[PDB]
Symmetry: D3
Subunit: 241 residues, 6 copies
Amino acid sequence: ADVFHLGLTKAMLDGATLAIVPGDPERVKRIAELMDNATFLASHREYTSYLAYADGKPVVICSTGIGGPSTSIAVEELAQLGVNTFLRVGTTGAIQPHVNVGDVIVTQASVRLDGASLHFAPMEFPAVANFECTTAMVAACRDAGVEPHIGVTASSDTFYPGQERYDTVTGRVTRRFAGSMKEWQDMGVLNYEMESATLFTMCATQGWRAACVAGVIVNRTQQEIPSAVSIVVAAAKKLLA
Amino acid sequence: ADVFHLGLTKAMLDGATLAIVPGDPERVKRIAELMDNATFLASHREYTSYLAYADGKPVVICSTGIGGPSTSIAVEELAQLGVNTFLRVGTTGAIQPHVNVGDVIVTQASVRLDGASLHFAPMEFPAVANFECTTAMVAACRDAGVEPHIGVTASSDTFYPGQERYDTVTGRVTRRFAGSMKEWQDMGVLNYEMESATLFTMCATQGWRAACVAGVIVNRTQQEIPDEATMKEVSAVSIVVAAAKKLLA
Amino acid sequence: ADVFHLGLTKAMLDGATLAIVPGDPERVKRIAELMDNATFLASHREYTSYLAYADGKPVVICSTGIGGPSTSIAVEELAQLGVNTFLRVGTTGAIQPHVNVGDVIVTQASVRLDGASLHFAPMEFPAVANFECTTAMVAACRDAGVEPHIGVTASSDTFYPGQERYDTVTGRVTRRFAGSMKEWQDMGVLNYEMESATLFTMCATQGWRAACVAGVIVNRTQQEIPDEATMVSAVSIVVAAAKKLLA
Amino acid sequence: ADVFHLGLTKAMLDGATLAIVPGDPERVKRIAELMDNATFLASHREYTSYLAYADGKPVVICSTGIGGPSTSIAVEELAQLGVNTFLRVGTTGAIQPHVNVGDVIVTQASVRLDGASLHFAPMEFPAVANFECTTAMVAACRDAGVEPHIGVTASSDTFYPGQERYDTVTGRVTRRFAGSMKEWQDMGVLNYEMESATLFTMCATQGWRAACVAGVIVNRTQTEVSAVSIVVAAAKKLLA
Amino acid sequence: ADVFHLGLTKAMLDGATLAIVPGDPERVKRIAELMDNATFLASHREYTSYLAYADGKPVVICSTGIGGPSTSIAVEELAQLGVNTFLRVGTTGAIQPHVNVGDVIVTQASVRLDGASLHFAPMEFPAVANFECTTAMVAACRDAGVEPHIGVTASSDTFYPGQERYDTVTGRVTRRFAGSMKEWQDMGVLNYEMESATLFTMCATQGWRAACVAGVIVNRTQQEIPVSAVSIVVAAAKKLLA
Amino acid sequence: ADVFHLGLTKAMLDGATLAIVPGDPERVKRIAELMDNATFLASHREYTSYLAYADGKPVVICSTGIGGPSTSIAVEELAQLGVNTFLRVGTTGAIQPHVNVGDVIVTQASVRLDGASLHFAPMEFPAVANFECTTAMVAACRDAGVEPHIGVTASSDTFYPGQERYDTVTGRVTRRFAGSMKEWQDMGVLNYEMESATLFTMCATQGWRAACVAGVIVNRTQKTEVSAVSIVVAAAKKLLA
Ligand SMILES: [Cl-]
Ligand SMILES: [Cl-]
Ligand SMILES: [Cl-]
Ligand SMILES: [Cl-]
């Protein structure tokens, strides 16, 4: 391979410059098969990668794993092989009561509750998505009869205390995060997930385009524990046309 | 008045819910006069305000002054009078070599090199513009045949050291900011100005819509301050009025 | 002009090395007129400037606007034209219960609730006024039969949440500032204003002298905003201090 | 399942209270098979889990994935199923000239170059391993004829800039990490890896025991079976 | 004793409300003996205490030890016994070339390169001396024919790396402090010492008066390692008590 | 002298490479006299230093004063004279109900509630004791029939507010430390003291070995003096054997 973790070479990508980057390795083949000629590339650690064709254009589909650290490896190594655009498709918990399970959120920018973003820029830098890519995501939603929620997401390095979940072994949340969900609710933040702050900060600072769409699987105003994929594919087609 | 600084009452706004917020009180009249029935409202401190009508709907035009602190007062007090959308029109210094003087920049989000944004949200929160408003600014640029630069802006509480200017009395920049311009350049940041981080943070956290367009007056890869040699087109002021019309249509 | 914002040249200052720097452009003429031969210099943006003479010595009077950012421009550009001493005169809200409306506060040092001071020094550096200029302010108060309150001021980048005002559209204050007024009260801080932390930090680190006197316009233990029920001028004091310093 | 990510129930663990937690899911089977009656349990996302028996006592082997975030989910969910002791066995890059390929590092504590640790304690708190478990790791090394290097590890949320790698697309390292490798070298830091600050901070603050032993696979300045055999030996010591 | 560390009771102070607080326990007697009826009170740990009388009024003289932590104990426990004014007399290294060995510096405020100040207020709060007490220190200097240096001091929790000294076992200074002495020089900072940031922040926030005068024993523009400050602090105390 | 504060030269130490560093200068002689041929070296400020012999090997006993700052001077200056190992024996207040008066605490690592540690490394670096020295302390405890509590200590630059003490003139604790004792209790922290964060961080970063043992004489939630000093001497012997 020509990269350290992913097991890929540039030739395997057939000129792809755009990647769809789900968190879950098990979702990669499913996404690839929404496109044409889905082709296995590699699987190592949490990084499963496929190639497929979106209206004739090559697209890499590669899992990131959960969290900014594993995401940062995948993004860098794909960029080493010529990828310059990264479309995340994920799952998310809504924190606003008006967002329903099954809805779609397009993240414009993220609250940086991660560590890896700080390995690309100091905190003052905004974890903002690429405008053109966000625009394509919104258009793809509307083409499908979905009005997405568009706004700010809290992007956390933990699933449990950093999303102010209390149904845990200790039931404690450290002072920094105690009360934090209500703070983000009051600031209009839509939802929590675990990769977008890293993704957006690393891509914005390194000259790559990023965007994120996620399906809502729980509403945190109700409970702690309970398609986006069709939209991300449609957005990829818009961007590669 | 109904508010403590601006000298305005709610009635003076005639139902306006959208403001155009230039930094310079002296720019307010010219912006207002691009619309219909421009009328002077008030002038107190750095806050000069006019009303005008865009395709029949009232728009308030109110300066902010330079910096987040004076901006924060104008935004809050306008919001107390019913304003929920704030379109900043500004001037800016570009830091990328081929962003020409006379170009326009639409700021999608800002590096928070300000203090006032922290009075609305901790640093981790993104100083991001409203999507619909940013979209309207981009569309207005394109209608006028200008492809804007769209990206991240460094929004500083100083003009001199925080923008790494050295042609100053002491010629020194404190450690935090020494080398910083190159850091933002390397990160693809387009430009510097002095109000958008506060504006965007305060609006996003309080439920208001904000956006920012600015004309480039100097390119920092060539000059610290523009002079008569600097390049001397489509104005940011015409663009922000066009964007307001789109939003209000 | 020879500076980018103020519209001034060195010649226009007629040798002045001391500036009186109110926040409000509309106050500049009034201050100038307490001195002799008041002369308009320029007005651009929030920066109105006059020249006048204090017992025969030239003094520039130049507004800063509200906030550290606009202050930082006026101070640097005035220093480029030879000013080395900056006497702020302002308005302020008191936070101790027996600091009355109409009283005067001489700020010795400030709590740095601003961003611009960090563009001159890291947070550990004290936002402290010049001792000789503070002393002159105190002497001027006492010459007028006013005992000033002398102490620490909280210098904020906002009027509303950073001063823990709640009578706002959202009625919310972010976590950092929730409970903060009480913290400053408990620490003996006298008052809030919006320019002194920047002023003092930038002047101390660049080799210039600064000081700040302000009139109390509201007491925050009683009211957020003064109204018609709310109860010697700071401007007369600052002029008297300038005379002491330039004699 | 009884937990949201791992796909496990408490009954599947047969009363296990100790977990061996490698980063790589593809390493789990190999560790499990060093013990008795190894049995595949589940695989979901980066979390592959097996059960095996160490001198008659059940031990869970569960991968974490790379990084503190995915590790934090695995540790919490294993703890919800009754696990109280977490032994990491990983790979690492050495940054001291005297730490040779083939040597073993036992991490006593970590430089917190991560974000997840802050979701358990503010930065002042030390990302320190459990003394008893560290002691068992050291004894297991020595039983194998290895004197381990025992010391501080830099635990980074990135592989590239946070380890001051310049062999990247942009070739840039943000100011925070510029010159940082030399700073850690000068402070005696032995190596970089990507999970121990989170693991140690979360375990210390939540009342669980953690330790970490890793094989040196590269030395930035200039074994695989050994490190896994050692962690299994340490587990047996702790369970005896 | 009425306090945890100093070994003092309120009665031992005979009504003293002002303390002179040198760093060095071994300097306390000398200072006390500049006043009347100097009396040894106690010695425990780094805290040696004497009483003396300045123009008829009792003054306590109590060492702090080096650093904010030990200072913070002495100040609090003296305040528990009724002390409300703390005049530090110290030694210091100058970092400006125009300040000579033997000169005196009156610290108006300090760069908070300490930890204990943060146990009284967040960093944004200024480590500033009391105006009246600083005024008395300046007046005492002038009465003695010395124009003091009046300004900002860098107050460090270390003698070695936090003062950017390199003549050490490792010869290294961590990144935060590398280059820092030049930063402070350029900002007009006069000198380094090790107690004033803590003293000033704790006193300002707790409602007590503090000031600091120190004699310059080295100039750091020349070397890392190489009195009338004591006569001056006593004279300042007299002014404040008159 | 060879060093500015302690008043020592290298020759005076007779080759000693290990120091026992109590806080209280008055404790120095008492520690020294548990060893052989106790010999006064110097006394300046809060720094009283003795030499004595532990199983034939020279050991320095030198007080630090209270707090990181004065400790940092003593450690550096002793290291300039060849000392490479620093064993603290101190006093402490316990904050866990199960830690009884009479018990012993061996501090493995510290919460950095100090300033001087930051003059050696940024906050991310762990204030961790040397493993071999900690191991010797634990063995010394057990040789004497004591099972020590081994864990994390909160190391504060103040006795009063930073230990969340309200028994003060003002009765106030600044926001940073309000509620902090409970936070440390919930994280398993055993006790407060005032030097170990500085000692551990400075020693780890400069290449020296440090450890810390303390007898519990009080507990914030609810003979020993002789025991803690006997233990540290026994640990020194293990280390110099
Ligand atoms: Cl969720
Ligand atoms: Cl500019
Ligand atoms: Cl006010
Ligand atoms: Cl010195």
